[PDB]
């Protein structure tokens, strides 16, 4: 997959919008899948992209929530710009995707990450979207961002 290619380029440049839209970072207290990211660490390269596509997709969609953010003062067009930023590389690598074979059952890995994004959101409504749900959220999302890159390194 050519599209894993300068991807410390989509981690740097969306780690620094998320780190711009808003204050400093709130403290990690909430859920993080990271068993998940260490099994896809050693998992195969197509599973590794596939988790990529499916992990950004949900990023955007959990993010792309401007209706549900009037608690929080970040920056909606840099909030655009970061939905922008991995839109275009997830749409790159669904390219590769297209090419693998679609499987015997659905991968444990779409199910939990699935589980996990479920998770966030539902937390987020307990909490009618406060300002320090949102900080959950936008702290949790950091830490798929850093651990995404070593998979995409890993991949590559
Ligand atoms: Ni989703």
Redesign the pocket.
Known sequence: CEWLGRYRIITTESLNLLKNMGGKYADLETPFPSRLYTLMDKSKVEDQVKFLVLTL??I???MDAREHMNSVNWDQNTVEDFLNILHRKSSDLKECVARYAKPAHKESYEIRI?RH?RTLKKILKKKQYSAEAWEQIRRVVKSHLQRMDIIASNAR
Do not use: A, E, N, R
């Open positions: 997709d949900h955007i969609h959990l699935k994004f």
